[PDB]
Structure formats: structure tokens, C-alpha cells
């Protein structure tokens, strides 16, 4: 068999986003079209279905490193805070959009809440991760 | 009386709250590790505290 | 296999150097046969340690100048890797042989200086370094406010240097400096 670490993570997130588009029950609001991701970013994201990419990334990050809250999600969503003529710094991501991603993934039956915070991944979802890893392996082979 | 105007401005922030304990000057105050001591007297009695210039 | 080493898709063989002077300074043959020219450093200790550095690594390192390009070695290796593809599709022959012929053609021997002006010859290592600096400066001057990329400009400069029709920047500055040195002697 294969594993998601042997699977390259560039096409794995796109295949999992295609799987979540095949599912299509992950609570997409209407303010996603008008929202900006964070204050260090300038404009809106280009692709319209950019909730499912964040959901796929949150799924693989909770699969690899479980037990994470708001700060571990805002750490990966960061960049250069270009204020202007002032020298730039680092800024954290938004909290509410990651909280809505966690609420959508908790409403979907693939995770389970853990003590002292965090959403671990259930053995039912581990089978699904292994099957989609086999699907990406069969697609690349 | 004058005691009403004496305790009128609060001293709850910055150099109005804390000052040097030797020269009582509002210049060169280190708030780190609770020193509250000017840099000239710090360089003077720097060896008696335990600091030394090795490198 | 250790019998043959393919630099991307190019072996060590089919490299003929005509000039015996530049072949002693260029030490890419028989020792520095690599797959990628990436390295850490320490090629500037001895006076003649700089000649032991391979010319592909020199072409890699000499591109990054003028502040904003510092720290783009991973960029410029891929740029030169595309530049080999641009050269080979138009030329047909070996791009390594094209580059060796360009180094043979672009050598400024004599140059005057203010010490009257004393017109004297320079070192062959100085000729190689001057040729590399002139080709990188010409590529950086050509690729500015233009859609044409770094690999395309560097490929056009190497093809014009291999042709030798006063079109390349290094060939033009070589002919200009030899004209000035022939004038003031």
C-alpha cells in the first residue's frame, strides 16, 4: 500500500478538494465571496471555491499533527504585512474563518473532539485517507 | 488646602511612577529585572552586583 | 552509472577546446563533472583558487547582482537550465561547445591604463573573468523593461558571441577596447 506522506502534497490537496466538491455538504456561506482572508493580504482570493482548499489543508494538518487550535491554524496562514512606506513585519491569519472551517469539519463525520482542545481524526476517517491515498497513487500510476 | 492639589495628578505610569533610587533622575532607567537604576551608577557599582567584562 | 555523467542531459564528452591558454584555467574537465552546479563556497582562498571553480558555477553566481537578486541561486540555476534548452533547439550542436567557442572569441588581450597611457596585456584568467562579467552585464542591461526573459537574453547573447558579427555585448566591448588599445599605442 501507499501513504499520504509518500503521496506528493501538491496534487493531494487538489484531489481532496475535488473529493470535497464531490461531497458538497460542508456549509459554505455567502460572505466568503466578499471576505478578505487576513489583514496582511491585499485582495480577495482568485478562485471561487477556496473554502474547500482550506478544508482539505485543515484535514491533512489534523491528520499529521493533531491537537491544534486557533494559533496553529493562523500560523500557517501568514505572510509579509506590507503596511506601506514602513518596514514590513509578520501578521497572523484570521480566527473566525478557521473557526468556521473547524465547525464544518466537526459537522462532517470525519473528526472527533479531544480533551484540552483539538480535533483528532477518527479511525473511520483514517480508512478514508488511506483510500484516497490509494486513489491518488492509482491516478499517478 | 495645598494637600488637595498635592494628590491630584496620578502617578500610575512611566517615569512618574518609578525613578532612580540613587540619583533620582528620569534618565537611563532600566525596568528589566527590577533595577530602576541609572546607567552611570550601574557602571560604577557594576562589579559589586556580579557583572564583569569578560568578552 | 559512474562511467558517464550527464549534466542534465549532456555528457562530459564532445567538448573540444582549441585554445591551450584558456584550457589550463578552465578546470571543468575531468574533475568537476557534476549533475547540478550548486555548491556552498570556499573558492577564493588562494590567489589561483578562483580558476578551480567551474565555469557553470561561475555563470550561476555572476548573475545575482544589484541588491534585489541576492539569494536567487535556485532561480538562476533553473534559468540557465532553460537557457540550454533555448540554445540547443536553435543551434543544433553542443551548447557546451558553443560556450567554449564564445569564451575563445571573447577575450580582451590588451588594454591601456593611466599610470600617457600604458597599453599592456592582461592575464587569461582576467580575460575569462572579463568575458563572464561583460556577458552578465549585457544580459542584465538587455533584460530590463522588456517581455524577453533572462534565459532568452542570455541565449541570444551566447549565440551572437558564437557568431561574432559585432552583435553580442561582450564581442562589441572586446572589439571596442582592442580598438582603443590599438589607437593609443
Amino acid at each position: 500500500g501507499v501513504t499520504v506522506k509518500d503521496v506528493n502534497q501538491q496534487e493531494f490537496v487538489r484531489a481532496l478538494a475535488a473529493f470535497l466538491k464531490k461531497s458538497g455538504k460542508l456549509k459554505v456561506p455567502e460572505w466568503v465571496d466578499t471576505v478578505k482572508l487576513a489583514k496582511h493580504k491585499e485582495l480577495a482570493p482568485y478562485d471561487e471555491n477556496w473554502f474547500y482548499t482550506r478544508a482539505a489543508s485543515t484535514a491533512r494538518h489534523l491528520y499529521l499533527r493533531g491537537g491544534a487550535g486557533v494559533g496553529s491554524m493562523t500560523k500557517i496562514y501568514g505572510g509579509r504585512q506590507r503596511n506601506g512606506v514602513m518596514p514590513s513585519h509578520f501578521s497572523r491569519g484570521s480566527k473566525s474563518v478557521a473557526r468556521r472551517v473547524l465547525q464544518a469539519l466537526e459537522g462532517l463525520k470525519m473528526v472527533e473532539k479531544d480533551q484540552d482542545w483539538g480535533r483528532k481524526l477518527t479511525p473511520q476517517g483514517q480508512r478514508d485517507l488511506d483510500r484516497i491515498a490509494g486513489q491518488v497513487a492509482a491516478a499517478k500510476k | 488646602g495645598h494637600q488637595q492639589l498635592y494628590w491630584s495628578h496620578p502617578r500610575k505610569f512611566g517615569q512618574g511612577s518609578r525613578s532612580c533610587r540613587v540619583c533620582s533622575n528620569r534618565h537611563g532607567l532600566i525596568r528589566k529585572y527590577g533595577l530602576n537604576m541609572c546607567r552611570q551608577c550601574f557602571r560604577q557599582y557594576a562589579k559589586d552586583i556580579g557583572f564583569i567584562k569578560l568578552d | 552509472t559512474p562511467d558517464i555523467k550527464l549534466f542534465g542531459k549532456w555528457s562530459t564528452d564532445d567538448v573540444q577546446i582549441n585554445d591551450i591558454s584558456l584550457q589550463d584555467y578552465i578546470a571543468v574537465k575531468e574533475k568537476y563533472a557534476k549533475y547540478l552546479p550548486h555548491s556552498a563556497g570556499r573558492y577564493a582562498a588562494k590567489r589561483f583558487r578562483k580558476a578551480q571553480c567551474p565555469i557553470v558555477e561561475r555563470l550561476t553566481n555572476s548573475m545575482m547582482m544589484h541588491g534585489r537578486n541576492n539569494g536567487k541561486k535556485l532561480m538562476t540555476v533553473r534559468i540557465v537550465k532553460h537557457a540550454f534548452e533555448i540554445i540547443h533547439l536553435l543551434t543544433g550542436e553542443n551548447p557546451l561547445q558553443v560556450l567554449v567557442n564564445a569564451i575563445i572569441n571573447s577575450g580582451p588581450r590588451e588594454d591601456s591604463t593611466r599610470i600617457r597611457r600604458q597599453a599592456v596585456d592582461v592575464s587569461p584568467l582576467r580575460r575569462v573573468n572579463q568575458a563572464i562579467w561583460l556577458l552578465c552585464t549585457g544580459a542584465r542591461e538587455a533584460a530590463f523593461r522588456n517581455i524577453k526573459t533572462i534565459a532568452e537574453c542570455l541565449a541570444d547573447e551566447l549565440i551572437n558571441a558564437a557568431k561574432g558579427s559585432s552583435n553580442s555585448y561582450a564581442i562589441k566591448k572586446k572589439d571596442e577596447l582592442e580598438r582603443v588599445a590599438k589607437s593609443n599605442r
Binding site: - | - | T1, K34, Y35, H38, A40, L74, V77, K81
Partner: protein
């Protein structure tokens, strides 16, 4: 057979790695992944330089587990490149005979020293009164 455990560290910079050798089938892994998804893809052949020179016969019995911490990315590449090379030299040194180890070592000596011996190149500390270590500020005249 018995567990042929060889643990060799590789240190060139802040990025460090520990290579663990074993008998059995040939599957080289770095924390449970092969060398095929390395970003960037430009340095794909850099870790295959010790692979292509020795051949597929030498890596048949050798499987290496690598743990990596610290540094950057290309520093981690040079760290694992030095660590698996020194672990492979120790593996051919300690268990099997010395003639094959010398035959493998004669290839690694002629090619590069970075595979075997590290250089003491670290970051020099910043000096006071300048933007960096060597450079100073601009002197204000008049």
C-alpha cells in the same frame, strides 16, 4: 539476522540529521518518505550523486531511517547527504570486510570532501556600530 543498528549524525550547519542503518530489503526513507517529492525539483540529482556512482547493487541490503531537525532546506539536503554517506561508510566499515569498504571509500575520496568531512563554516556574530559584521555606518562630516 541480528539488528545491525548504526546511528551516525551528520552536521555541517544548524540543520542536523541522524541516519540509522539496518539489514534487510532496500528502502531509503527520511522520516517515512522517499527522495521523490523534494521541493525544489532542481536538486533531485544532488542526493542521487552518491546513489548513481555506487549503483543499485550497493543499496540492495541497506535501508536508512533519517530524522532531521533545524536549519533551512538546502542545509537539510547537505545534512542528510553527509549523514547517509558517513552512515554507509560506518556500515561497510564495522560489519563487512575492510577491502570492500576501501573500494567504496576510494570513490568517495576522489569526488568530494563534503560527503565525508564537514567544514567549520558558521555565521559570524554581528559587531556593534554597523549594519553587519564587517560594514560600518556612514560617517557624518561637517
Amino acid at each position: 539476522g541480528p539488528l545491525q543498528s548504526v546511528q551516525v549524525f551528520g552536521r555541517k550547519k544548524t540543520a542536523t540529521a541522524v541516519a540509522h542503518c539496518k539489514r534487510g530489503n532496500g528502502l531509503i526513507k527520511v522520516n517515512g518518505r522517499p527522495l521523490e517529492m523534494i521541493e525544489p525539483r532542481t536538486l533531485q540529482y544532488k542526493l542521487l550523486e552518491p546513489v548513481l556512482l555506487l549503483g543499485k547493487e550497493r543499496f540492495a541490503g541497506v535501508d536508512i531511517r533519517v530524522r532531521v531537525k533545524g536549519g533551512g532546506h538546502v542545509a537539510q539536503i547537505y545534512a542528510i547527504r553527509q549523514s547517509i554517506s558517513k552512515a554507509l561508510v560506518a556500515y561497510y566499515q564495522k560489519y563487512v570486510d575492510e577491502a570492500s569498504k576501501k573500494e567504496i571509500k576510494d570513490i568517495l575520496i576522489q569526488y568530494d570532501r563534503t560527503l565525508l568531512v564537514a567544514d567549520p563554516r558558521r555565521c559570524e556574530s554581528k559587531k556593534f556600530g554597523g549594519p553587519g559584521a564587517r560594514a560600518r555606518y556612514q560617517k557624518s562630516y561637517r
